[PDB]
Design a protein around this motif. Structure first.
Motif, PDB file in Angstrom:
ATOM      1  N   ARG A  19       0.748  -1.172   0.041  1.00 48.00           N
ATOM      2  CA  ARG A  19       0.003  -0.142   0.143  1.00 48.00           C
ATOM      3  C   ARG A  19       0.723   1.218   0.011  1.00 48.00           C
ATOM      4  O   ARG A  19       1.868   1.357   0.746  1.00 48.00           O
ATOM      5  CB  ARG A  19      -0.700   0.108   1.484  1.00 48.00           C
ATOM      6  N   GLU A  21      -0.526   4.084   0.744  1.00 44.73           N
ATOM      7  CA  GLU A  21      -1.203   5.070   1.776  1.00 44.73           C
ATOM      8  C   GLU A  21      -0.416   5.635   2.893  1.00 44.73           C
ATOM      9  O   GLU A  21       0.067   4.815   3.521  1.00 44.73           O
ATOM     10  CB  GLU A  21      -2.568   4.381   2.129  1.00 44.73           C
ATOM     11  N   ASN A  22      -0.597   6.863   3.190  1.00 43.52           N
ATOM     12  CA  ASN A  22       0.389   7.578   4.269  1.00 43.52           C
ATOM     13  C   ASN A  22       1.547   7.462   4.450  1.00 43.52           C
ATOM     14  O   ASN A  22       2.245   7.564   5.355  1.00 43.52           O
ATOM     15  CB  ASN A  22      -0.449   6.978   5.543  1.00 43.52           C
ATOM     16  N   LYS A  58      -1.377   9.608  -4.676  1.00 41.82           N
ATOM     17  CA  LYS A  58      -2.697   9.324  -5.334  1.00 41.82           C
ATOM     18  C   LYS A  58      -2.490   8.639  -6.706  1.00 41.82           C
ATOM     19  O   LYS A  58      -3.241   7.503  -7.055  1.00 41.82           O
ATOM     20  CB  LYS A  58      -3.360  10.558  -5.623  1.00 41.82           C
ATOM     21  N   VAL A  61      -1.469   4.999  -5.740  1.00 43.42           N
ATOM     22  CA  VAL A  61      -2.410   4.509  -5.354  1.00 43.42           C
ATOM     23  C   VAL A  61      -3.451   3.579  -6.433  1.00 43.42           C
ATOM     24  O   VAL A  61      -3.775   2.535  -6.417  1.00 43.42           O
ATOM     25  CB  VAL A  61      -3.649   5.027  -4.519  1.00 43.42           C
ATOM     26  N   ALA A  62      -3.665   4.502  -7.454  1.00 42.81           N
ATOM     27  CA  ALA A  62      -4.323   4.267  -8.565  1.00 42.81           C
ATOM     28  C   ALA A  62      -3.722   2.984  -9.187  1.00 42.81           C
ATOM     29  O   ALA A  62      -4.432   1.948  -9.754  1.00 42.81           O
ATOM     30  CB  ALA A  62      -4.767   5.293  -9.648  1.00 42.81           C
ATOM     31  N   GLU A  65      -3.888  -0.154  -7.497  1.00 43.13           N
ATOM     32  CA  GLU A  65      -5.182  -0.995  -7.803  1.00 43.13           C
ATOM     33  C   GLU A  65      -5.355  -1.731  -8.762  1.00 43.13           C
ATOM     34  O   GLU A  65      -5.996  -2.538  -8.881  1.00 43.13           O
ATOM     35  CB  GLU A  65      -6.178   0.172  -7.571  1.00 43.13           C
ATOM     36  N   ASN A  69      -6.177  -5.513  -9.732  1.00 38.13           N
ATOM     37  CA  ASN A  69      -7.280  -6.048 -10.790  1.00 38.13           C
ATOM     38  C   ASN A  69      -6.643  -6.865 -11.869  1.00 38.13           C
ATOM     39  O   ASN A  69      -7.516  -8.175 -11.984  1.00 38.13           O
ATOM     40  CB  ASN A  69      -8.023  -4.918 -11.537  1.00 38.13           C
ATOM     41  N   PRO A  83      -4.460  -0.492   6.584  1.00 37.81           N
ATOM     42  CA  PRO A  83      -4.274   0.988   6.436  1.00 37.81           C
ATOM     43  C   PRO A  83      -3.700   1.514   7.638  1.00 37.81           C
ATOM     44  O   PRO A  83      -4.394   1.341   8.812  1.00 37.81           O
ATOM     45  CB  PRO A  83      -5.531   1.657   5.995  1.00 37.81           C
TER      46      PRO A  83
ATOM     47  N   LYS B 268     -11.180   4.077  -7.846  1.00 35.92           N
ATOM     48  CA  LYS B 268      -9.940   3.221  -7.977  1.00 35.92           C
ATOM     49  C   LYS B 268      -9.046   4.037  -8.764  1.00 35.92           C
ATOM     50  O   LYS B 268      -8.125   4.376  -8.448  1.00 35.92           O
ATOM     51  CB  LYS B 268     -10.119   1.868  -7.826  1.00 35.92           C
ATOM     52  N   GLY B 271      -7.481   7.172  -7.658  1.00 37.37           N
ATOM     53  CA  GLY B 271      -6.485   7.049  -6.571  1.00 37.37           C
ATOM     54  C   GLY B 271      -6.893   7.413  -5.050  1.00 37.37           C
ATOM     55  O   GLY B 271      -6.140   7.869  -4.345  1.00 37.37           O
TER      56      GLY B 271
END
Lengths: 360, 360
Positions: A19, A21-22, A58, A61-62, A65, A69, A83, B268, B271
C-alpha cells in the motif's frame, strides 16, 4: 495450507500486494543517507517526518489498484496490508522515530515452504512496519501456516557506522569489498529482500541493511532443509537483491549488467542461463526517491512463462518475448518512486509446486 | 458570510443540530412501508399519528444536548431548529397528513458553497418540515447567504408506485437494478441526504425518496460549477447515502461492505482510498425504527483528523485510530432510534476552506 512457496516462479496462487497510503519520508539519519542519492538529500532534509507528496501518492494508489485487478484477472488471490498512518512518532528505550510505509511486502516478509518469516529490518523508521501485516499473518496462522519473526534489533547507535563515508567517496566499494557497510555486526539485522529463493538454495547478499549476523541467523534457522549461500556483486550501495540478481525460472537468472556477481562461475558451472537485461528507459527527471533505475528487472513471475513487467519498459519486454515468456504489462511508474517494482510490491504466499534443487 | 461549505471534512465552524422533541410516528403509507423493516410494521400500524415513545425521546434529548456541549467544546457554533409540535394534521389539495420531526437536518438542508438548499422531500409526513428551519435560514439570508428551495412536489398519488412489492420479495433488488423504486418520475423529489459533497464533485444516489428528476434538477441548478454524478450500490432499500458511502477526507471514503458501489472503479482509478468499516456492534434488541444498524459509519468529521464517532462502536473507533484520526466519542444510542447518526443529526453550515477538485 494457505502458505506454501519454495521459489520465485511456480504457478502463483496467492499474493500480498503493498500500500502507498500515508507513506512518510523517513527522518534523515545515517542509514537513510547511506541509501539516498545526492540528488534527493535536500528533499529528505526538508520532508523527513512528513508524507510523501500526496498528489504523487494518489497516482501510485491508482496504479497499484489496477495491478491488483490484473492479478485477480490472472487468477491470483490478493491480500493487502491494513491501512496505517505512518506519521506516528514512536519511542523505544533506544531511539525515537516516525514510520515509513507498508508498500514493499518483499522487504519484510519472506515465505520458505509453509513458513512466513518477518524480517527484523535495519532502519529505525521501519521498526514497527510488521503491524500492517499482522491481520493477514494471524489468519494464515489460524489456518495452519508456520509463523516466525526473526529477532527484532535494538537499533541502538552501536548498530550503525556513524562515521560511514556516505557523503560520497565511492571507496564505499572498498569497504563493500571488505563486506563493510553502514550497519555493523552489533546484532542481527536484515531485510527479507536481500534473500531470493530457488527451492533448497536461497541466496543472500550482505548489504547496507543485512549483516552477516542476520544471514547466519537465517542459515541456522533454516538448516538442514535449506542452504543459504552468500553472494556478492560490484555495488557501492546494496539494499535488496531483486534488482541485481532476480531468479526467474529453474536455472535462469537476470543479472544486472552494472552489478556483476563475484560468484557467477558457481552458476555457470551449474548450467544456469545468465541473461543480462537491456538498460531501463525511465526518464532521469522522474523521481526515484528510494532506488535506482533498475526497477525494470524487478519483475514478478506469475509462472515460468508469464511475467508481470512494466508497461513503459519496452526493451526488456521484447527480451522476454524472444524467450517465449508472455508479458503482462502494467504501468507502475509512480509507485516506482516509493522504491520498488513488481517483486518488491508483492510477497508470494502460495505457488503451486514442490521443494526441489536446481543447483544440481 | 456565515454560510460556506464545499465538502464533508474541512475545519468545521458552524453546524445545525436537529431536535427529537415532539417527533411523531408517520402514518403508515406506501412510502413509509417501503422503508420500514417487517419487524416494526405493527408499531407503525398502531403508533402512526402519535408521538414516538416519550420515555425514549427524553433519552434522545439528553444525548443530543450532550453532543451539543461537545461541539461547543470543540469550538463549533451550534444552531438548533425551532420547537414544533409535529402531531398537527395538515391538508393540501393533494393529501392530508401528520408530521414527522426535525431531528435530521441532513435530510432537508444541504450547503453547496455559500448557498443553502432546502430539499423538496418525498414523504407526505415531511411536507412541512422546512418550517422548523426558517428562523435559522432567514438569519443567514439577512447576513448574505444564497437561499434556494427546490420545487416542492404535490406528492399526489401519481408520485408513488402504489403497487410496489414492499411486502417483502427482495426482487426490490431487480427493480432497484432498473433504477425503479417506490417513487415514480411523476415530479422532482429528493432528500438532501442522498447527495454527499466533495468540492466540485457531488455524488447522488437514485433511491426510494430521490428520483432521477430530482437529481437532474440539482445537476441543472448547480452546473457549470459543480458536477453531480449518479452512483449506485447493491441495496434493496436505499434512503440516503451517508450510511453507505460516507466521504471522510480528500480522496478517502468509507464504503459499507454490505452495499458495494457499482462504480467503485471510477474511484479506484482516481487514486482514492476505499476503507471498509467493521460491522456494527449495536444489539439487535435496540429499536432502530427508521434505519439499519449501519449508523455506525454515519460519522461526522470535525476536520480531516477529528471524527465524532459513537462511544459504543469500539471496532470502528479502533479503525480511525490506526489511521491517525482522533476519535471524539459521543453516545447517541437512543437518538439512533429516530433514524440517524452524527452526519444525519447535523448540517454543516460553515467549514474553513476552498472549492477544490479531488477527482483529479
Amino acid at each position: 495450507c494457505p502458505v506454501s512457496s519454495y521459489n520465485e516462479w511456480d504457478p502463483l496462487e496467492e499474493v500480498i500486494v503493498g500500500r502507498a497510503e500515508n507513506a512518510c519520508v523517513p527522518p534523515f539519519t545515517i542509514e537513510v543517507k547511506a541509501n539516498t542519492y545526492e540528488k534527493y538529500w535536500p528533499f529528505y532534509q526538508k520532508q523527513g517526518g512528513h508524507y510523501f507528496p500526496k498528489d504523487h501518492l494518489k497516482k501510485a494508489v491508482a496504479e497499484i489498484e489496477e495491478m491488483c485487478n490484473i492479478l485477480k484477472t490472472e487468477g491470483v488471490t490478493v491480500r493487502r496490508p491494513d491501512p496505517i498512518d505512518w506519521s506516528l512518532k514512536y519511542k523505544t528505550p533506544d531511539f525515537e522515530s516516525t514510520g515509513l510505509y507498508s508498500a514493499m511486502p518483499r522487504d519484510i516478509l519472506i515465505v520458505v515452504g509453509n513458513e512466513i518469516i518477518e524480517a527484523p529490518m535495519a532502519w529505525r523508521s521501519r521498526f514497527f512496519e510488521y503491524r500492517a501485516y499482522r491481520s493477514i499473518i494471524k489468519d494464515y496462522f489460524h489456518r495452519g501456516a508456520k509463523w516466525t519473526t526473526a529477532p527484532k534489533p535494538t537499533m541502538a547507535d552501536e548498530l550503525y557506522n556513524q562515521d560511514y563515508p556516505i557523503h560520497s567517496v565511492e571507496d564505499r566499494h572498498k569497504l563493500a569489498a571488505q563486506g563493510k557497510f553502514v550497519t555493523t555486526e552489533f546484532e542481527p539485522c536484515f531485510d527479507a529482500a536481500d534473500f531470493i529463493r530457488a527451492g533448497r538454495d536461497i541466496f543472500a547478499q550482505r548489504s547496507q541493511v543485512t549483516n552477516y549476523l542476520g544471514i547466519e541467523w537465517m542459515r541456522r534457522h533454516l538448516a538442514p532443509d535449506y542452504r543459504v549461500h552468500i553472494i556478492s556483486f560490484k555495488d557501492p550501495n546494496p539494499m535488496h537483491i531483486d534488482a541485481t540478481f532476480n531468479i526467474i525460472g529453474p536455472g535462469i537468472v537476470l543479472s544486472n549488467p552494472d552489478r556483476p556477481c563475484h560468484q557467477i562461475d558457481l552458476f555457470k558451472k551449474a548450467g544456469w542461463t545468465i541473461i543480462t537485461p537491456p538498460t531501463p528507459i525511465i526518464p532521469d527527471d522522474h523521481p526515484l526517491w528510494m532506488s535506482s533505475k533498475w526497477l525494470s528487472m524487478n519483475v514478478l513471475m506469475l509462472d515460468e512463462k508469464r511475467v508481470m513487467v512494466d508497461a513503459n519498459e519496452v526493451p526488456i519486454q521484447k527480451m522476454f518475448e524472444k524467450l517465449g515468456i508472455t508479458t503482462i504489462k502494467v504501468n507502475i511508474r509512480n509507485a516506482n518512486s516509493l522504491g520498488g517494482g513488481f517483486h518488491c510490491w508483492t510477497c508470494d504466499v502460495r505457488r503451486r509446486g514442490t521443494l526441489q534443487s536446481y543447483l544440481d
